[PDB]
Amino acid sequence: VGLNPNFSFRGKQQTRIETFSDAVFALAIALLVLSSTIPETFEDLWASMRDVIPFAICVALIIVIWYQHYIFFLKYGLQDKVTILLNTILLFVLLVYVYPLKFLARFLSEIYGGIFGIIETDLSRFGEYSHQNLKLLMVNYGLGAFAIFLVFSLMYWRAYKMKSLLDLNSYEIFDTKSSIIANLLMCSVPLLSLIITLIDPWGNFRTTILSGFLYFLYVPIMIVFGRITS
Amino acid sequence: VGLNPNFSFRGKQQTRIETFSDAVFALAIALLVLSSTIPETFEDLWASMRDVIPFAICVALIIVIWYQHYIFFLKYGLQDKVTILLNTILLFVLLVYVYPLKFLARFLSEIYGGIFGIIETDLSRFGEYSHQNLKLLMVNYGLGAFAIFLVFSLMYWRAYKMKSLLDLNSYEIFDTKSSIIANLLMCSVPLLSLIITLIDPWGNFRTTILSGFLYFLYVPIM
Amino acid sequence: KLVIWINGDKGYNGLAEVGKKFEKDTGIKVTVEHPDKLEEKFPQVAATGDGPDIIFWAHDRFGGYAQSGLLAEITPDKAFQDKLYPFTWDAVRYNGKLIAYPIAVEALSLIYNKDLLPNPP
Amino acid sequence: KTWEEIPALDKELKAKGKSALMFNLQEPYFTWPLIAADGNAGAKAGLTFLVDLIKNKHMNADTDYSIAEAAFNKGETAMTINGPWAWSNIDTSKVNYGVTVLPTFKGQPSKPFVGVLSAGINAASPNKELAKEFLENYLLTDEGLEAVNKDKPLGAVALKSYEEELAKDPRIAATMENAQKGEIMPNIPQMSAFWYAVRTAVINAASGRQTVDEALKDAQT
Ligand SMILES: OC[C@H]1O[C@H](O[C@H]2[C@H](O)[C@@H](O)[C@@H](O)O[C@@H]2CO)[C@H](O)[C@@H](O)[C@@H]1O
């Protein structure tokens, strides 16, 4: 049922923090889709169906965050001020990046649409694709991703700080320690793009290519950390 | 209380996946209605009252999905990655067909309104009803319905794959197997309309007319 | 004395509790024995000596006993016959004669520790 | 989490008719972690703090194993310093207890001495082979150590087969945490004279006879 067979799930009962959180995750994925205009004609209907690829990418991304949230609150059943604070920071970041994700997802769907040869529609709608704007694109979304994983690391550290109060066993202590490392390692990749973009070594699009290409190198580093624990 | 007296309901306690899901079903049916503009004059009010027939159709359709969801999570109490994945795909499909259904329900509510003789308002409001558009319509809402029943079949198959972990008895195994068949049989009707509209045997409205008729004979064709 | 031979991995204590209710309603003793290698000790002892009155084993060993003449033909009335599944009676039939009473179908399964292994092979 | 924040906590608790920390001050094994937290300059720092606790009336002068144990189990003190063996008596009482890392002193951790409970055979015994049988085939077995452990906990057993059961216990985790922050005692013959030197030194400074500087002078000799 769960991630670890040695973990004793303290948060099987639903709480207010989790109920509130569920609404906000639902509210996020739901308003991402339902923020669109209602089709009034066949032309609008076909236009609206072009949005499903961008939405699928966004939704997939948000549930992945929801899953990590579900697992944390399941593991520790925490409900204190500091957990509430860190939880709010998380939902706050999520919320401010919902509509920007809708944007990024639509933009990248057009770029990848052009490449594969499915469509040939204009990108002038997005408003001047300049070096400064494409750099700010990385820095923005990179700063968002870094923060989410940074907060997950802080949340696990708060549970680690309360290990004795939570009666955590050697397996659970190890999991908690590994979960901190995992989230800091996850955060490192957007932190590395963001830094590369902010320095801008090449002074041109090359910077943005490299910054974007680091997301493709998540998979190998994740495998190293997974292999080390096994 | 439940569907089967021989089934032991593992999901009587509410979980996060079910709470999140409930918000999204509510968020769907609620934003379908409340996506409309607030009437500022009687003219705007009487217009939003025409919209209730399509809303009733839509709401009825969404709770039917919510019911199937309620029964699945009640039966197995599942909460694993794969169940989360399949559950997300479902809510994703739902969410994409909320505003499209608001449109189809309005589109049919106008056509069927004209037939019965309740109203006599135009269908040019819907912007060219060409063969390709009315074909694409049946391919769209047919692809949506197929993919919702397809997902319900996958969800029941995931429970069947975990039969021993869930300690399912002979009655429960039978129910699970029957629920897979039911959902694949439900999915087959939209899969047929969709294939008819795509192949297009007649090359004219004879195709689209049939594609809509296969849903009216859901029970008999099953 | 009513003597029954059944394997030691089965429920002989429970079979004895049935035997204890039999003695209350009749007066006959019902001892339940579980000797080692009873499947190959029965056809040697039952042929020559007395051995048991009733022998319990999977149906596969009974055809050999039937050919050798070590088992009485079973003659159960329709009403008793009807209480058991007709497929079960077929397993206890050798050359159109019922050679035993069917009790239960047995098959090996994979028994696993859910704590050490939640999703077994 | 720190030793230096106990006086504040004690002021808070004494108002409500409760002590903060009560532990065995007579036996030096209990006071050594605080003394050895920094280290000499480290022993002088650690002991002066311990002396200031008794001088500020936070701890009693003649606090022994029994009155400390009893006070914690009764629910009079909020904290105590003890080993695995002490847990069973707490379980007997109706006290929701926790076992955790020892407090830090001067930022650095308090280094508790680590002991390995060990069974030795007396050289002047005729039953040497009978004792070897008992120790190997009956005591140092899963079943054997279980019996001892359900009476009064042994701590982290030396048996390889007991790793899973040890790891499932939160108190063992806290014990291993402190054991890593501490160090294993050398077995050397001088340990006896050492322990006696520390036992007197701590008692003299606690009661109010010898100074902290003069305690380490007499102890190093
Ligand atoms: O107090 C000094 C004393 O400490 C250690 O003894 C411990 C013993 O190891 C524990 O098992 C526990 O019972 O308490 C004893 C102290 O009260 C040293 O092992 C010993 O040499 C030394 O005298």
Numbering used by the authors:
A (entry chain B): 9 to 238
B (entry chain E): 9 to 230
C (entry chain D): 123 to 243
D (entry chain A): 244 to 282, 302 to 483
Published text:
The vertebrate TMEM175 proteins are composed of two homologous non-identical repeats, each comprising six transmembrane domains forming dimers; the bacterial homologues consist of only one such repeat and form tetramers. We obtained a crystal structure at a resolution of 2.4 Å of a TMEM175 channel from Marivirga tractuosa (MtTMEM175) and in combination with functional analysis, propose how selectivity for K+ ions is achieved.
In crystal soaking experiments with the T38A mutant of MtTMEM175 we could not detect anomalous signal for Zn, even when using concentrations of 2.5 mM (0.5–2.5 mM tested) and contouring of the anomalous signal at 4σ and 2σ. Indeed, the T38A mutant of MtTMEM175 retained its sensitivity for Zn2+; in WT and the mutant channel Zn2+ caused at a reference voltage of −60 mV the same relative inhibition (WT 66.9 ± 12%, T38A mutant 69.7 ± 10 n = 4). This suggests that the bacterial channel is inhibited by Zn2+ through a different mechanism, that is not a pore block.
